[PDB]
Amino acid sequence: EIDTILSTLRMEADPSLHPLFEQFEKFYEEKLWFQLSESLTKFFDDAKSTPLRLRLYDNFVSKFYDKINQLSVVKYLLASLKDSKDFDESLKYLDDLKAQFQELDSKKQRNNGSKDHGDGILLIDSEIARTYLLKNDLVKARDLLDDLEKTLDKKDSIPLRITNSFYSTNSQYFKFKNDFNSFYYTSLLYLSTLEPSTSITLAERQQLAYDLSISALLGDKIYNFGELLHHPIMETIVNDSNYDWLFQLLNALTVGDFDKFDSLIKVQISKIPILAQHESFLRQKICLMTLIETVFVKNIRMLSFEDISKATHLPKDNVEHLVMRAISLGLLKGSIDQVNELVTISWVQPRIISGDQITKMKDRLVEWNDQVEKLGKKMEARGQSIWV
Amino acid sequence: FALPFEEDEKNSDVWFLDHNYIENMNEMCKKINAKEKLIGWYHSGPKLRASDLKINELFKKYTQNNPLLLIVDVKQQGVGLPTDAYVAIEQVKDDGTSTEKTFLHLPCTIEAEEAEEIGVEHLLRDVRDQAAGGLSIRLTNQLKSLKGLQSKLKDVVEYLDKVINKELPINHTILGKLQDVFNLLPNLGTPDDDEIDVENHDR
Amino acid sequence: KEEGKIDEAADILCELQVETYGSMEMSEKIQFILEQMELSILKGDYSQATVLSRKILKKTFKNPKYESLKLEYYNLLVKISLHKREYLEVAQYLQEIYQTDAIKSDEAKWKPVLSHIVYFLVLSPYGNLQNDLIHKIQNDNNLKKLESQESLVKLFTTNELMRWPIVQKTYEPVLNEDDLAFGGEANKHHWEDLQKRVIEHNLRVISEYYSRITLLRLNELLDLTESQTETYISDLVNQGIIYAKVNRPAKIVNFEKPKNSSQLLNEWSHNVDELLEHIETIGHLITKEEIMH
């Protein structure tokens, strides 16, 4: 029935993919088809580059989809139309299996008294929008993404796997428009909710990584940089030439050293034109980070112009323009004076909190605590006998 | 009201809860007052467990609201908070981590019913912990408040110490609140502070 | 029209048509009046035109059969207004056209209609009508179909410190080949208006961010003498847009509303109250964090 097709597929396949065919037939004989899902996924990681995933999956999906979970059918589906070049081709499977799952949820569910099937529709609507972005029909994709987003809020128990697909489709959308800030926040949700049983290879970590990082440097309100050190995706990728400088540029940015920053950017202008055309934004970005960092750890909440003039290594004239941007963006908030030559802030924006910041926070409460105690001892002694 | 429950000391995530009693209780008490419906469950305390996270999924099924966890401290080793209120919610969690199940503290207030007030005052024959009546009560109170401020602040010192020395995970909500604390700290020699001094002469 | 009597000729016919007639059907009456407005502009009398405009009703053009007529009416009505130099009303008129189905559907009819709305929203001199209207054009992505227009509206909306020639330079070849905007001989006084408008926005910027700043430094920012600057600071202290105090000696200009003894005392209570709240929630969360760990 299905035996001939698998036999044609195995002959086309390499000798290293040969035992995986053998296992499909072995498991089929036993009549456990869950064991069959496990094997199938393995095959599709190492054979998405051969065109053989586009015929293998159909045979299994269109018999079992009820003897195997909804996650299994979609798992296969994602890998198959992953590298596919014709989007007209791609659209037709997504629609055929959407209609199938709808029908499934009326019949199986009454009889077993178990098993949902309406979860599977949700994940297909992500992949239709993903397919629309790839045609360069960006706008259209966004109308289904709003519709799915509403459907999601109806649910009070939303899965990881499903919203991981959804945050993803959204993150691709913004960076095609080259919105750096919009991308970075939405990607932080994707990375954090990222599943343990991935659809992400080591090469795909690099490509994602790069998009995370570029946005970080070229932002204008992104001064959370420690969540690329709290995700393996960019954290342990740093040993590649490309990701050596790319990581360094973040460290330079963080610590406010102008010597290191100058050395680094010279190379990255000529080589990369996205760093080149945005080099002005990037340059003023380092300088704004100096302002907020330097006032936080000090227990005063104002700085002179003269302090800043030395700090950013620029004129007293520059100070006016950069400190002004800081109020606009909302990095800082406060009053600016040129007559008394001060900027006295009333707010610092929240950041991700590294080890030195916590030490200074500690030494502040040791000062505080000691005062309450002294103010207290004097008042316990005075009027000791009268409290009635 | 009590329900039947059983607990194991070998693994602590092994327990019995009786559902059948729950069904009978609801039927009986509806007639007593049409103002009793399921709103969650108390946990007798004195502490919050992580095992109360699992028990919560039972009560989440029984009633369509997020169910209140009510800690009733009956061992009273905390000078405040005899009642703590907690509603389990799901939120995505700092330091690159997953959607985790957590219990978020809310106000745990007492305001009392009319009905309740009448028995409460009657039984009372003490001059109360705090009432804030005469000047005598509030002079006591001022000094009590100061000891109060210090006690909360102390636990915070030891939290920051332990992040950088004893590797408890960095939760940016607690660090962020301290930022906000420091930005509402009056600074001497500003016009706000100077005004306080003048007003003291006038009062 | 050809004779010297175009004024006299229009005057007779308007007298006739300001008397409604029942022998006239709905479509005919509405179309006929639109003609009479055009003639009052040619007369040179703009009062007469306001009257004729309001003779016909606005809610008669909200039927789909009278949509042919609806476009002619709001286009006319801008011309009358624009001359009278009311920049708020025009921007609100053109927006009505923008919403029209005919203009929107066809992917080139909507194009100059939007461009025009940007120029008059900006030319309008502050007001809270400005803020809501201009925030609607910003959310649209049909302002992401033109690259000229996005830069101009956003530059007037956002809080930025900027000077006259930088802005002037950016917009000097762009908007001069567009008439019924900046291109015309009388609309050389709407390019002249554009200078005031960017410095009217600067004063709003400058007042929030900067409490006390030198008068001298302020002069170079609006790119004028001290005499001119001080007048223009005053206009907006009266219209309540800013509160400022300007010293003739060129000591200071103190951009502020002065607090009183009570306001300082009130503001210092809230700081101390809200503080206490933050301390207490923190201790709640220490207990949670360690227990789960």
Coordinates of N, CA and C in Angstrom, one line a residue, chain B residues 41-167:
Chain B
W41 N -9.6 28.4 48.2 CA -9.3 27.4 49.3 C -8.3 28.0 50.3
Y42 N -8.3 27.8 51.6 CA -7.3 28.2 52.5 C -6.3 27.1 52.7
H43 N -5.1 27.6 53.0 CA -4.0 26.7 53.2 C -3.6 27.2 54.6
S44 N -3.4 26.3 55.6 CA -3.4 26.6 56.9 C -2.0 27.2 57.4
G45 N -1.0 27.1 56.6 CA 0.2 27.8 56.9 C 1.2 27.1 57.8
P46 N 2.2 27.7 58.5 CA 2.4 29.1 58.6 C 3.1 29.7 57.4
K47 N 3.4 28.8 56.4 CA 4.3 29.2 55.3 C 3.7 28.8 53.9
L48 N 4.2 29.3 52.9 CA 3.8 29.0 51.5 C 4.6 27.8 51.1
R49 N 4.1 26.8 50.4 CA 4.9 25.7 50.0 C 4.9 25.9 48.5
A50 N 5.7 25.0 47.8 CA 5.7 24.9 46.3 C 4.9 23.7 46.0
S51 N 4.4 23.0 47.0 CA 3.6 21.9 46.9 C 2.2 22.4 46.8
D52 N 1.9 23.7 47.2 CA 0.6 24.3 47.2 C 0.5 24.8 45.8
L53 N 1.5 24.9 45.0 CA 1.3 25.1 43.6 C 0.6 24.0 42.8
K54 N 0.9 22.7 43.2 CA 0.2 21.6 42.6 C -1.2 21.5 43.0
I55 N -1.5 21.7 44.3 CA -2.8 21.5 44.9 C -3.8 22.4 44.4
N56 N -3.4 23.7 44.1 CA -4.0 24.8 43.4 C -4.7 24.4 42.0
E57 N -4.2 23.4 41.2 CA -4.7 23.0 39.9 C -6.0 22.3 40.0
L58 N -6.3 21.9 41.2 CA -7.6 21.1 41.5 C -8.7 22.1 41.7
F59 N -8.5 23.2 42.4 CA -9.3 24.3 42.7 C -9.5 25.2 41.6
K60 N -8.5 25.3 40.6 CA -8.6 26.0 39.4 C -9.6 25.3 38.6
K61 N -9.5 23.9 38.5 CA -10.6 23.2 37.8 C -12.0 23.3 38.3
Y62 N -12.2 23.2 39.7 CA -13.5 23.3 40.4 C -14.2 24.6 40.2
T63 N -13.5 25.8 40.1 CA -14.2 27.0 40.0 C -13.5 27.9 39.0
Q64 N -14.3 28.5 38.1 CA -14.0 29.4 37.0 C -13.9 30.8 37.6
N65 N -12.7 30.9 38.3 CA -12.1 32.2 38.6 C -10.7 31.7 38.9
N66 N -9.6 32.6 38.8 CA -8.3 32.1 39.4 C -8.6 32.0 40.9
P67 N -8.3 30.9 41.6 CA -8.7 30.7 42.9 C -7.8 31.3 43.9
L68 N -8.4 32.0 45.0 CA -7.6 32.5 46.1 C -7.0 31.4 46.9
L69 N -5.6 31.6 47.2 CA -5.0 30.9 48.2 C -4.9 31.8 49.4
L70 N -5.3 31.4 50.6 CA -5.4 32.2 51.7 C -4.5 31.5 52.7
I71 N -3.4 32.2 53.0 CA -2.6 31.7 54.2 C -3.1 32.3 55.4
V72 N -3.6 31.4 56.4 CA -3.9 31.8 57.8 C -2.9 31.3 58.7
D73 N -2.1 32.3 59.2 CA -1.0 32.1 60.1 C -1.7 31.9 61.4
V74 N -1.6 30.6 62.0 CA -2.2 30.1 63.2 C -1.2 29.8 64.3
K75 N 0.1 30.1 64.0 CA 1.3 29.8 64.7 C 1.9 31.2 64.9
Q76 N 1.5 32.2 64.2 CA 1.7 33.7 64.6 C 3.1 34.1 65.0
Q77 N 4.1 33.8 64.2 CA 5.5 34.1 64.5 C 5.8 35.4 63.8
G78 N 4.9 35.9 62.9 CA 5.1 37.2 62.2 C 4.2 38.1 63.0
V79 N 4.7 39.3 63.3 CA 4.1 40.3 64.1 C 3.0 41.0 63.3
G80 N 3.2 41.2 62.0 CA 2.1 41.5 61.1 C 1.8 40.3 60.4
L81 N 1.1 40.5 59.3 CA 0.5 39.6 58.4 C -0.1 38.3 59.0
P82 N -1.1 38.3 59.7 CA -1.7 37.0 60.1 C -2.4 36.3 59.0
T83 N -2.8 37.1 58.0 CA -3.5 36.6 56.7 C -2.6 37.0 55.7
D84 N -2.3 36.2 54.6 CA -1.6 36.6 53.4 C -2.6 36.1 52.4
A85 N -2.8 36.9 51.3 CA -3.6 36.5 50.2 C -2.8 36.4 49.0
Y86 N -3.1 35.3 48.2 CA -2.3 34.9 47.1 C -3.2 34.3 46.0
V87 N -3.1 34.8 44.8 CA -3.7 34.3 43.6 C -2.7 33.8 42.7
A88 N -2.8 32.5 42.4 CA -1.9 31.9 41.4 C -2.2 32.4 39.9
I89 N -1.2 32.9 39.3 CA -1.2 33.5 37.9 C 0.0 33.1 37.1
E90 N -0.1 33.2 35.8 CA 0.9 32.7 35.0 C 1.5 33.9 34.3
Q91 N 2.8 33.9 34.4 CA 3.5 35.0 33.8 C 4.9 34.6 33.3
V92 N 5.5 35.3 32.3 CA 6.8 35.0 31.8 C 7.8 35.7 32.8
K93 N 8.9 34.9 33.0 CA 9.7 35.0 34.3 C 11.1 35.4 33.9
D94 N 11.7 36.4 34.6 CA 13.0 37.1 34.4 C 14.1 36.0 34.2
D95 N 15.2 36.5 33.4 CA 16.5 35.8 33.3 C 16.5 34.8 32.2
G96 N 15.6 35.0 31.2 CA 15.4 34.4 29.9 C 14.5 33.2 30.1
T97 N 13.8 33.0 31.2 CA 13.1 31.8 31.6 C 11.7 31.8 31.1
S98 N 11.1 30.6 31.1 CA 9.8 30.2 30.7 C 8.7 30.9 31.4
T99 N 7.4 30.8 30.8 CA 6.1 30.9 31.5 C 6.0 30.0 32.6
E100 N 6.1 30.6 33.8 CA 6.2 29.8 35.0 C 4.9 30.1 35.8
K101 N 4.4 29.1 36.6 CA 3.3 29.2 37.6 C 3.9 29.8 38.8
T102 N 3.2 30.9 39.4 CA 3.7 31.6 40.5 C 2.5 32.0 41.3
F103 N 2.7 32.5 42.5 CA 1.7 33.0 43.4 C 2.0 34.5 43.6
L104 N 1.1 35.4 43.2 CA 1.4 36.8 43.4 C 0.6 37.4 44.6
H105 N 1.2 38.0 45.5 CA 0.7 38.6 46.6 C -0.2 39.8 46.3
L106 N -1.3 40.0 47.0 CA -2.3 41.1 46.8 C -2.4 41.6 48.2
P107 N -3.1 42.8 48.4 CA -3.6 43.2 49.6 C -4.5 42.2 50.3
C108 N -4.4 42.0 51.6 CA -4.9 40.9 52.4 C -5.8 41.4 53.6
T109 N -6.2 42.7 53.4 CA -6.9 43.6 54.2 C -8.0 42.9 55.0
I110 N -8.3 43.5 56.1 CA -9.4 43.3 56.9 C -10.0 44.7 56.9
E111 N -11.4 44.7 56.8 CA -12.3 45.8 56.8 C -13.5 45.4 57.5
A112 N -13.8 44.1 57.7 CA -14.9 43.5 58.4 C -16.2 43.7 57.9
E113 N -17.1 42.8 58.3 CA -18.6 42.9 58.0 C -19.2 43.6 59.1
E114 N -20.4 44.2 59.1 CA -21.2 44.8 60.2 C -21.5 43.8 61.3
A115 N -21.8 42.6 60.8 CA -22.2 41.5 61.6 C -21.0 41.1 62.6
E116 N -19.8 41.1 61.9 CA -18.7 40.7 62.6 C -18.2 41.7 63.7
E117 N -18.5 43.1 63.4 CA -18.0 44.1 64.3 C -18.4 44.1 65.7
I118 N -19.6 43.7 65.8 CA -20.4 43.6 67.1 C -19.9 42.6 68.1
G119 N -19.5 41.3 67.6 CA -18.9 40.4 68.4 C -17.5 40.8 68.7
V120 N -16.8 41.4 67.7 CA -15.3 41.7 67.9 C -14.9 42.6 69.0
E121 N -15.6 43.8 69.1 CA -15.5 44.8 70.1 C -15.9 44.3 71.5
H122 N -16.9 43.4 71.5 CA -17.5 42.9 72.7 C -16.6 42.0 73.5
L123 N -15.9 41.1 72.8 CA -14.9 40.2 73.3 C -13.7 40.9 73.8
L124 N -13.5 42.1 73.1 CA -12.3 42.9 73.4 C -12.6 43.6 74.7
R125 N -11.5 43.7 75.4 CA -11.4 44.3 76.8 C -10.1 44.7 77.1
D126 N -9.3 44.6 76.0 CA -7.9 45.1 76.0 C -7.9 46.5 75.4
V127 N -6.8 47.3 75.6 CA -6.7 48.6 75.0 C -6.2 48.6 73.5
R128 N -6.1 47.4 72.9 CA -5.9 47.2 71.5 C -4.3 47.5 71.2
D129 N -3.7 46.7 70.2 CA -2.4 46.8 69.7 C -2.2 48.2 69.2
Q130 N -3.1 48.7 68.3 CA -3.1 50.1 67.8 C -4.5 50.5 67.6
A131 N -4.9 51.7 67.9 CA -6.3 52.1 67.8 C -6.2 53.5 67.3
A132 N -5.2 54.3 67.7 CA -4.8 55.6 67.2 C -5.9 56.6 67.7
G133 N -6.2 56.6 69.0 CA -7.2 57.4 69.7 C -6.6 58.7 70.3
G134 N -6.2 58.8 71.6 CA -5.5 59.8 72.2 C -4.1 60.0 71.7
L135 N -3.4 61.0 72.3 CA -2.0 61.3 72.0 C -1.0 60.2 72.5
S136 N -1.4 59.5 73.6 CA -0.6 58.4 74.3 C -0.5 57.2 73.4
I137 N -1.5 56.9 72.6 CA -1.6 55.8 71.7 C -0.8 56.1 70.5
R138 N -0.7 57.4 70.1 CA 0.0 57.7 68.9 C 1.5 58.1 69.1
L139 N 1.9 58.2 70.3 CA 3.2 58.4 70.7 C 4.1 57.2 70.8
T140 N 3.3 56.2 71.2 CA 3.6 54.8 71.2 C 3.8 54.3 69.8
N141 N 2.8 54.8 68.9 CA 2.7 54.3 67.5 C 3.8 54.8 66.6
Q142 N 4.3 56.0 66.9 CA 5.4 56.6 66.1 C 6.7 55.9 66.2
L143 N 7.0 55.5 67.4 CA 8.1 54.7 67.8 C 8.0 53.3 67.4
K144 N 6.7 52.7 67.3 CA 6.5 51.4 66.8 C 6.7 51.3 65.3
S145 N 6.3 52.4 64.5 CA 6.4 52.6 63.1 C 7.8 52.6 62.7
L146 N 8.7 53.2 63.5 CA 10.1 53.3 63.2 C 10.8 52.0 63.2
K147 N 10.3 51.1 64.2 CA 10.9 49.8 64.3 C 10.4 48.9 63.2
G148 N 9.2 49.3 62.8 CA 8.6 48.6 61.7 C 9.3 48.8 60.3
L149 N 9.7 50.0 60.0 CA 10.4 50.4 58.8 C 11.7 49.7 58.7
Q150 N 12.4 49.6 59.9 CA 13.8 49.0 59.9 C 13.7 47.5 59.7
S151 N 12.6 46.8 60.1 CA 12.5 45.4 60.1 C 12.4 44.9 58.7
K152 N 11.5 45.6 57.8 CA 11.3 45.2 56.5 C 12.6 45.4 55.7
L153 N 13.4 46.5 56.0 CA 14.5 47.0 55.2 C 15.7 46.1 55.3
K154 N 15.7 45.4 56.6 CA 16.7 44.4 57.0 C 16.8 43.2 56.2
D155 N 15.6 42.7 55.8 CA 15.5 41.5 55.0 C 16.0 41.8 53.6
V156 N 15.8 43.0 53.1 CA 16.3 43.5 51.8 C 17.7 43.5 51.7
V157 N 18.4 44.0 52.8 CA 19.9 44.0 52.9 C 20.4 42.6 52.7
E158 N 19.8 41.6 53.3 CA 20.3 40.3 53.3 C 20.0 39.6 51.9
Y159 N 19.0 40.1 51.1 CA 18.6 39.6 49.8 C 19.7 40.0 48.9
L160 N 20.1 41.3 49.0 CA 21.1 41.8 48.0 C 22.4 41.1 48.2
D161 N 22.8 40.8 49.5 CA 24.0 40.2 49.9 C 24.1 38.9 49.3
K162 N 23.0 38.1 49.3 CA 22.8 36.7 48.8 C 22.8 36.4 47.3
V163 N 22.5 37.5 46.5 CA 22.6 37.4 45.1 C 24.1 37.3 44.7
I164 N 24.9 38.0 45.4 CA 26.3 38.3 44.9 C 27.3 37.4 45.7
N165 N 26.7 36.6 46.6 CA 27.6 35.8 47.5 C 27.0 34.4 47.6
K166 N 25.7 34.1 47.3 CA 25.2 32.8 47.7 C 24.2 32.4 46.6
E167 N 24.2 33.1 45.5 CA 23.8 32.8 44.2 C 22.3 32.4 44.2

